[PDB]
Paper text:
As a biomedicinally important test target protein, we chose [name], which plays an essential role in processing the polyproteins translated from the viral RNA37. Peptidomimetic inhibitors of [name] have been shown to be therapeutically valuable for the treatment of coronavirus disease 2019 (COVID-19), with one approved for clinical use (nirmatrelvir, PF-07321332). Here we report how a selection campaign employing a non-canonical peptide library containing cyclic γ2,4-amino acids resulted in the discovery of very potent inhibitors of the [name]-[name]-2 [name] ([name]). One resultant potent [name] inhibitor (half-maximal inhibitory concentration = 50 nM), [name], comprising 13 residues with γ1 at the fourth position, manifests a 5.2 nM dissociation constant.
To gain structural insights into how [name], including its γ1 residue, interacts with [name], we obtained an X-ray crystal structure of their complex to 1.7 Å resolution. The structure reveals [name] bound with high occupancy and in the same manner at the active site regions of both monomers in the [name] dimer. Excellent electron density was observed for all residues in the [name] macrocycle. H3GM4 is accommodated in the S1 subsite, forming hydrogen bonds with [name] C145, H164 and H163 ([name] residues are identified by a subscript). The F2GM4 residue binds in the S2 subsite, making hydrophobic interactions with M49, M165 and H41. The y1GM4 side chain forms hydrogen bonds with T190 and Q192 in the S4 subsite. G8GM4, L7GM4, N6GM4 and L5GM4 form a loop leading to γ14, which is linked to H3GM4. γ14GM4 is positioned to make hydrophobic contact with T24 and T25; the side chains of L5GM4 and N6GM4 are positioned close to the surface of [name], with L7GM4 projecting towards H41, C44 and T45. The observation of the unnatural γ14GM4 residue, the cyclobutane ring of which was refined in a near planar conformation, in the P1′ position is striking and implies it contributes to the inhibition or lack of efficient [name] hydrolysis. Like the binding modes of substrates (predicted) and inhibitors (as observed by crystallography), the carbonyl of the amide linking H3GM4 and γ14GM4 is positioned in the oxyanion hole, making hydrogen bonds with the C145 NH (2.9 Å) and with the G143 NH (2.9 Å). Despite this apparently catalytically productive arrangement, analysis of the electron density map implies a lack of substantial covalent reaction, consistent with solution studies showing a lack of efficient [name] hydrolysis by [name].
Author numbering:
A (entry chain A): 1 to 306
B (entry chain B): 1 to 302
C (entry chain C), D (entry chain D): 1 to 13
Amino acid sequence: SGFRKMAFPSGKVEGCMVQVTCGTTTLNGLWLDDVVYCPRHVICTSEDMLNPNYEDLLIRKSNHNFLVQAGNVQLRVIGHSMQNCVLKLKVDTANPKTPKYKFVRIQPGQTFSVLACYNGSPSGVYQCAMRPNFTIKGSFLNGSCGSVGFNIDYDCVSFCYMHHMELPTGVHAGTDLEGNFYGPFVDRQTAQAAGTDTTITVNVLAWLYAAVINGDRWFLNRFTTTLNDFNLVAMKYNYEPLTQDHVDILGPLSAQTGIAVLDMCASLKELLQNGMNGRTILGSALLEDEFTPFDVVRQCSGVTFQ
Amino acid sequence: SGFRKMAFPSGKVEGCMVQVTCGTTTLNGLWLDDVVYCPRHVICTSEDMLNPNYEDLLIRKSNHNFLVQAGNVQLRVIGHSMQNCVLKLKVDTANPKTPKYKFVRIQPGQTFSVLACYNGSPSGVYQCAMRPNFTIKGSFLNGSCGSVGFNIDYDCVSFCYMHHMELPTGVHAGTDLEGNFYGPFVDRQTAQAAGTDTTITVNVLAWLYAAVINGDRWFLNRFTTTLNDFNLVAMKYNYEPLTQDHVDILGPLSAQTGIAVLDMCASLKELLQNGMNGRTILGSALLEDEFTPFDVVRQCSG
Amino acid sequence: XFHXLNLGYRPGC
Amino acid sequence: XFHXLNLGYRPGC
């Protein structure tokens, strides 16, 4: 029992973290096989960031302008190319600790672990979600660029996020591992802001199932709402619409607890309208939306990794 | 910016996790150099747990009664001893992934990372605190015994917890890496319960400093308090006494924010008396007490 | 009770 | 702004 915000074990990723320096700019890189991945703004000065032509700026760099450090070893850069907003540095040595991996672009509402790094050295691990507005509520200081987000299935690391920037509200924006930003953000020094966000309804429902699984049932009510009636109330509280696809996804948790998805919707509706009334759910005084249905099942069933 | 419940990177610990089996009982072990550490109840059947004499039970075992598996490789047990509530199995192979490590017994209020494991395989990592009642609010299913708690400083792993058991309220109890339980708990099947818990005052103050560092001041006020007056109010809300040592420990955060410790105490006092009134602090509607002053400095600075 | 599958752990005690 | 020392990151934008 117990239910905690839980990250994937970070070991497989720790073995891939390096430091990348170009001129006066230093940040983190990800070393997989004979390639090191990092934010392309590593090649920029402050002047350049106002209106960078990255093609032009990169052409002005040689292999020897990049200093890549793994632990206490300098890796020899033998090639460089840009892919969208990430730089790829080909090195003469394949990382012997390379895990089985893939790169995946995730959807909003999906969660992942972040390994926060500074100077190529792992500092900490925490769990986050891609918000509906394509930011993440991370914890990152200057120097954290190139830290990555990931999931693990059995022995395979799916990298989904590379950190690039912070927005005025203190939330974070970045790319997939192929350098495409999540959301409309750009790697140029120009005014940028997070859009209005919404609550990830399917995840709140998942967390309510987690609560039931852990013996926390005070909020249950069996006045089964309809999807339409529910979404009317959701709209009002700035919750994402719940689709039939979300209902299907909640199937296993519904079956495990014997509580119909639309009954849990009825409970959530009541929670939104009346609040928690001084009570907590899984130790929280607010409705939590950064556990997916998958996360709940994994944590409640004891799934492990190789 | 941002503030998250944050764990240490778990790689150094992952490389130490093994599966230990005796008879019908399987749990996790920690493999450091040529020794594997695990809960001594690995040697028990359910009958034995009612009133175990572990000295008597262990003397009935041989080295070959213990099956240790690292990955898909069987380690040969060549010795065994009991130390308090942990079993130590000497194996013929030193773990090549052994990090620099020490064993430390922590105080209530201190935080650590937990690497939850099943069948010697890592499942997840999370951060928790040793509660004043010497339990932890973890997430553990049957099979998680032998999972460990730890801190990391530069390259050195300080192991502070091995998991043994769950209490009726769903909280968790265990030992240090030398097998001494935190709290009054015993590794016998008999009625046990968590005592009434208290809030870790020094940590709440630390987290309020975290909030200020990240740009939130709404809960501050113009008042100060004395340590004595503050503790009078704390007592009433089931908060731990704040000592001068705690005040000294909060020094760096005080200096960084320019808010005197006793001024933040005045803010906390007001928060306890009036509540938050539907406002949040760092995304929380409750006062959070599982970040130490060191955790705040580590995460907010560097 | 104990988080080791034959040793009689029961959620809630 | 960007979380890489001299590229002008300012808390709050």
